[PDB]
Amino acid sequence: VTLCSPTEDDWPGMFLLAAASFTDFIGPESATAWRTLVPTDGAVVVRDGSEVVGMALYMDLRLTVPGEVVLPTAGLSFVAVAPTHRRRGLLRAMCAELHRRIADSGYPVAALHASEGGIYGRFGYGPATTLHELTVDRRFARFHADAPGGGLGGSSVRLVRPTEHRGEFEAIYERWRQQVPGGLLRPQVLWDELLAEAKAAPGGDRESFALLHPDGYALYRVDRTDLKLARVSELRAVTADAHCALWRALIGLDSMERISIITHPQDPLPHLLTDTRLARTTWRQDGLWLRIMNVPAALEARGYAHEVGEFSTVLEVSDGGRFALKIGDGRARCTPTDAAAEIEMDRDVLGSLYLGAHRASTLAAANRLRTKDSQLLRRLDAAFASDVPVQTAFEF
Amino acid sequence: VTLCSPTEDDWPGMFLLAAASFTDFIGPESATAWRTLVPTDGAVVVRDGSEVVGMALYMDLRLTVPGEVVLPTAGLSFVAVAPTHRRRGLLRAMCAELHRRIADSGYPVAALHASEGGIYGRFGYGPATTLHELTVDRRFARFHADAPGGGLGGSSVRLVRPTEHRGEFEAIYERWRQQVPGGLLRPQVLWDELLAEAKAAPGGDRESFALLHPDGYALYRVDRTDLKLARVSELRAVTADAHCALWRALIGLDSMERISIITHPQDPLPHLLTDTRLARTTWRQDGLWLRIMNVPAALEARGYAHEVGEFSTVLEVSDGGRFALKIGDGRARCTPTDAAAEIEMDRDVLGSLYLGAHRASTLAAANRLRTKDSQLLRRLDAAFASDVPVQTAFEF
Amino acid sequence: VTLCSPTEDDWPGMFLLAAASFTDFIGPESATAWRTLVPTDGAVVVRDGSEVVGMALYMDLRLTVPGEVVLPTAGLSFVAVAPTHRRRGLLRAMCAELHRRIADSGYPVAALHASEGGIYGRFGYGPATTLHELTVDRRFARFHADAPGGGLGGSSVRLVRPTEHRGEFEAIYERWRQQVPGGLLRPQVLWDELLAEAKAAPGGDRESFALLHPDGYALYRVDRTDLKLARVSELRAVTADAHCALWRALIGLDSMERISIITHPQDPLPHLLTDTRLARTTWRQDGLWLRIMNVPAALEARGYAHEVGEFSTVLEVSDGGRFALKIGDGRARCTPTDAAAEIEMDRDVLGSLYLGAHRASTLAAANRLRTKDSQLLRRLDAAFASDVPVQTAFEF
Amino acid sequence: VTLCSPTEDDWPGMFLLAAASFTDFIGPESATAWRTLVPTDGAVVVRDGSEVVGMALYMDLRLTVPGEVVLPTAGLSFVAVAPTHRRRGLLRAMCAELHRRIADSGYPVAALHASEGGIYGRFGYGPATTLHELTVDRRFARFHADAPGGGLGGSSVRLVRPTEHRGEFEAIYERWRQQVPGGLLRPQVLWDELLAEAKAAPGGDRESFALLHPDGYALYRVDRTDLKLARVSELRAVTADAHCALWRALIGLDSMERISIITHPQDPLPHLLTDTRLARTTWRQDGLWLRIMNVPAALEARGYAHEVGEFSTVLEVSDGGRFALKIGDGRARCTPTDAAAEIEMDRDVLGSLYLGAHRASTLAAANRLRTKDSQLLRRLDAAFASDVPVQTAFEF
Ligand SMILES: C[C@@H]1CCc2c(sc3nc(SC[C@@H]4CCCN(C)C4)nc(N)c23)C1
Ligand SMILES: C[C@@H]1CCc2c(sc3nc(SC[C@@H]4CCCN(C)C4)nc(N)c23)C1
Ligand SMILES: C[C@@H]1CCc2c(sc3nc(SC[C@@H]4CCCN(C)C4)nc(N)c23)C1
Ligand SMILES: C[C@@H]1CCc2c(sc3nc(SC[C@@H]4CCCN(C)C4)nc(N)c23)C1
Ligand code: NA
Ligand code: NA
Ligand code: NA
Ligand code: NA
């Protein structure tokens, strides 16, 4: 039961484990695309004597954090332990080794998408974005007078086949991800994959259409089994105008009863309608999870709210350091210290705070975060707040 | 088709309209309780030649706003137009008259609970609290190590019959409502009503039990039809300790599969569990709606975030005034002006901002709120933010 | 946190815990009936400093075992730990104390009905009867030619109000329980309770009717919500003729689509129909659980199959003794020994074997039961087999 | 409307009837596989003047009966009457002719799988195996301490692609079927078919995986529509160790909520868990049906329980003979006689008794089986009992 980097011979074994571990697995043809995003020495396998009974890897990603600052991010993925080798501490050992490598390679953060909400807390990962399903009953939907782009004259939105407008989708998404906390650089091979899923599959998903605006796009498809439901796979808008225009176009799908979209809690769509309530929140879940690999590097990289005055404190991260933290002018200086700690938290808690998705007040109230001073709590709430609302890019 | 204050003779007519308009109506025995909360000249009826074809009233309420400041609040309720007299502008006329009276009586705000999410925007009401259903699968629920009150020794929570501990429930709720934005004074007659619904009803609801803590209580009942579901009617906790203790006790209902509760978005319960995801958000809806009756009176009454520096602007409310607004030291001075407006909004939008439930960034993005300066937007977001999270007291 | 026999003052506290612990609880009016079946010193309570936070008791029952032998049986019931006092070893301590008393009082067995299938194994209880739901689609049901009581001339079955024929129901059930493994003496107060549930309850259950035969009866009611479903609460038949006659009468409920009954795996009803498959098994569950309190006393009391030759062995019960077991002539002699054990099992396993519901082959295959000799396994299978199929009397 | 053996020209007609009669029909490509198992003169067709309006055949099978004795078995299959030719006694005539041929060819038994539970009784077929669906909620499943193969060190179970381990599956199944009542020799062409269904089908079933042990295997696939459900198509285990090991591996499918398997009533899986009840029986049905073609030949071929003493009787089979039956030493001698019958039954009843699935007590109680002597009933129960529990091989 040894732990190594895989050789070319180990990959077929890994694809077998993958097919049996993940029900959304696509196959070797398509795993060869994603494989380009794994750096040399980005993968571990566990062999038994030999069949692969365990695997984990990371991908080289670019995460946009508050302040439009882009960080190199180890994206943990393809983690799997054979059902034959459960409760063997095989995950513990693989996660421990990839964390050594990610840290030594000089990634300040790692991120993942959690198959379950209870595995990853203990390895230092915190839920850091929030997924929000909105289902609109579009038969009753009337736009408010205050809504943009409701004057007469031509629409600036077009209905198009996705594949004939790759260039414009790449351009818009590139602008978007650079300016939104949670944004990820989407490499050529992931666009290749996105547009292969646009096409109708024999007894699978139906054709995907596109609403294209100069500063926005929406991909959507009719649900396989519910033919009055349109599922918006992805809506990226750079301007409020583009966002409204596209939603005008979606409410326009007159043969549909319901528009469905996975979006973020601050999505303005309910405020565009005369009836806020027609945009019902049907489902909510943790999106992206962060492990802060280097506390000073990460706290120093991001922007902070200008609207909170300058202030100083001592932050302890359980088994991850103690730091003089000083914040003003939306910059933070973070330096070693042995001064008495004023605030304490496990490293997962920092992950959750880091993109402004969760308030320190909220985590303090659960005692996930300790301080005696409730003024310092108000000051952290305010500073870590993200002016631009945090969103989730793509799952990996 | 005349509009008057009702006489004693008009009430039976109103109770008939009530029974046919509201499916949760309880009956004259119980409408005589609530009637004590209606002030003289707090009711209008519309007679046809005579049967009551329309009615509306307000109740004298005390709403707690940010800064632990308590405001006299006209609580609009018992609004109904006969199905025989729809699309007759009968609501428009009743709302217009009660608004004259509320304003002349010197209420700074009115509030209501909306049967539909699209009626009340046009009368100046904004959704100002957010209801959040959490359903916990309590068979998997393990409290985090960080969670309070998980040392050995006796529990400070008791299982009790609600009716034998009215005094302690009144005491705790009194402390609670005084310290939480959204808090309402609950008068004797509404406690009378709450505890009449505690008892099992023949082929109705099942017995209600109580978990009592020195600084918290939870009322809960098993669902009529789903006997693995416990419905938490009401949980009030003054301390984080009390909140955790009570949830420890609810996860302890071992014969239940699921605990259900209508709570607020900042409820810390998911952070108390090793798996955040076990606390699934199953339903979301607008809670309390506010109409700001007097813009200067209201902006001046509430506290604002100390963590935003002093700043000044000109706010216009569409057909509700234009004001020099100056905010610093968590106080606001609000005075008439004809200076060019820097920010504009309909009066409903102010209602939504007023308890800190909705960010001005979010409403700006929908163009419900107009400014050219995105620094001023950040400053409003920050100032109107409520340090203590806003909650919903009881429906009326 | 002390453990005592309750005083008269402790009972109201216990009824509160009961109402909050059991959703089928009926109330003090009706708990005073069952209380007559609890002997002096048959109850324990756990007080905290004082509110009852834990309770358990047994009832004096008479269980019929193979050989038509009737045993005094401690019926464990009304077991409950407050949700405020979970994971406090409060059950462990209450079960330990009642087991001391039951054993000292000279009960050879204890029995219970398990709210969950995973609590009671570790206290020495084994699932010993099997509940079997049969749902008949009675629109297709044709009796086989071989079926009894299908000649012309009058029926010997009558449709009657249950309450007007208590005497005949008592008589038939008395004959039944004396001749069937799993049979329990039903005392006057439990007949009182059975017939109080016969009557329709306002927005509850519907009227219960009775099909009465000289040697059998069936109580049945139409389902509250599904009006094409008849639920057979109880069918007791002493003769195969009585059993067939009653089923002829139930298939005769022409306004019903489906007859539903909780019965045993060897119920002959499918063999009475031309289509065995119309009697679909819709649900299966452990019925009565036994703890063998005294291994020699119990093994010696029951009859064994005459059709297996005489044979001898050494049985070890993990922490419950080691015995020379000799079986022939359907009697067993069971005496102490230090001779090497030939077969081993935890005490719960013996409970399961004891009424012939579970084969020792089946438990051996799971390694719940150890022997090197598969001939001895065949001999236990054969001996412990019950010629009359084992059934479940009433739940307590 | 004539009855003949089909010619090569008749087959296309039969495949058309097949497609319209059976919804699981695969097509001519695959019917050419199964056709190898039909002997010359094993098929009848009914032509109308000519289109095939009726067909029936048998296949040459090897059935394992108690005593590990393997019998040549006519497997009735592909029986169909056009919807245009119902209630024409076309089945009666086809069944009559195939029964002549099967009997003359010297098959002692015939078997079938019944599309409905009420057609085949009248042609002498008895339900002789019992199918049992177990659904495990694997999130709660904890193996008992008594369970095998729960020490540390490597697992002896492997996750593998079925197609790369045909040889080992054939070997294990061969051992299995030779030692289990209900066992059928699986010929090369049926393995060909089994492994063609292993592969994912476009908008059909998902990939099938394999858990392989030295003495056991399990094939399983994720359900098409319910992605938290794993359906175990087939689990064959020769040793109790192999059976436990494989179930440990299946409980290990951590991304699944439920494991589903069609198994037999004596499956030991519930006894392997600390909670017996987690293995819920979700569905039950008649499996294999037997027609005893030659009563003496068949009664003489099988083994009987050694644990019942020697005994003699006279058995009458309604229109199938009367026999001196003598049983001792687990052998039976069965010879003609005109001595007064002591026990009587239709021939279908014998079919049901023959593999020990159904107790003669149970069939006697329905009066499907007549005797005056209840000691003789106990002796038949005991003798016909199968020490190794009877199972169902594959459907045909
Ligand atoms: C070696 C590469 C690494 C990652 C990788 C593949 S295929 C593939 N497909 C996908 S599809 C996205 C879902 C979302 C949630 C988690 N699931 C695993 C998948 N993702 C990968 N990371 C990959 C092979
Ligand atoms: C004259 C008084 C005025 C208000 C009043 C009654 S009865 C009563 N019952 C209730 S119960 C609460 C639900 C919640 C949502 C809106 N529904 C109307 C009811 N409420 C009242 N305001 C009242 C008579
Ligand atoms: C002090 C006596 C002891 C037992 C007792 C009562 S009320 C009552 N009602 C019932 S009703 C039967 C269900 C079946 C499964 C388990 N549940 C608890 C109930 N049973 C009792 N033992 C009792 C009070
Ligand atoms: C001439 C041969 C005879 C039997 C045969 C085929 S195809 C085929 N496929 C199948 S698949 C198994 C199901 C199970 C229940 C009954 N159904 C009929 C099918 N079976 C056959 N006997 C056959 C052609
Ligand atoms: Na998001
Ligand atoms: Na709220
Ligand atoms: Na039973
Ligand atoms: Na079977």
UniProtKB/Swiss-Prot annotation, chains A, B, C, D:
The lineage of its organism: Bacteria, Bacillati, Actinomycetota, Actinomycetes, Mycobacteriales. One of its GO terms (molecular function) is identical protein binding. Increased expression of eis due to point mutations in the promoter region of eis is responsible for resistance to the second-line injectable drug kanamycin in a number of M.tuberculosis clinical isolates, through acetylation of its amino groups, which leads to inactivation of the drug. Belongs to the acetyltransferase Eis family. Disruption phenotype: No significant difference in terms of intracellular survival in U-397 macrophages and in an in vivo mouse aerosol model of infection. A strain lacking this gene induces more TNF-alpha but less IL-10 production in primary human monocytes than wild-type. Macrophages infected with a M.tuberculosis eis-deletion mutant display markedly increased accumulation of massive autophagic vacuoles and formation of autophagosomes in vitro and in vivo. The active site is at residues 120, 396. Keywords: Acyltransferase, Antibiotic resistance, Host cytoplasmic vesicle, Secreted, Transferase. Pfam families: Acetyltransf_17 (PF17668), Acetyltransf_9 (PF13527), SCP2_2 (PF13530). The Eis monomer consists of three regions that are assembled into a heart-shaped molecule. This shape is formed by an unusual fusion of two general control non-derepressible 5 (GCN5)-related N-acetyltransferase (GNAT) regions and a C-terminal region. The N-acetyltransferase domain of Eis is responsible for its modulation of ROS generation and pro-inflammatory responses in macrophages. It is an enzyme of class 2 (transferase). Homohexamer; trimer of dimers. One of its GO terms (cellular component) is host cell cytoplasmic vesicle. Acetyl-CoA binds at residues 79-81, 87-92, 115-116. It catalyses: L-lysyl-[protein] + acetyl-CoA = N(6)-acetyl-L-lysyl-[protein] + CoA + H(+). SUPFAM superfamilies: Acyl-CoA N-acyltransferases (Nat), SCP-like. This is N-acetyltransferase Eis. Effector that is released into the host cell and affects host immune responses; it negatively modulates inflammation, macrophage autophagy, and cell death through redox-dependent signaling. Acts as an acetyltransferase. Acetylates 'Lys-55' of dual-specificity protein phosphatase 16 (DUSP16)/mitogen-activated protein kinase phosphatase-7 (MKP-7), a JNK-specific phosphatase; this leads to the inhibition of JNK-dependent autophagy, phagosome maturation, and ROS (reactive oxygen species) generation for enhanced intracellular survival of M.tuberculosis. Can also acetylate multiple amine groups of many aminoglycoside (AG) antibiotics, leading to their inactivation, and thus contributes to drug resistance. Is also able to acetylate and deactivate the cyclic peptide antibiotic capreomycin, but not the other anti-tuberculous drugs isoniazid and pyrazinamide. Acetylates kanamycin (KAN) more efficiently than amikacin (AMK), even though Eis seems to bind AMK with higher affinity. Does not acetylate and inactivate streptomycin, apramycin and spectinomycin. One of its GO terms (biological process) is response to antibiotic. Its EC number is 2.3.1.-.
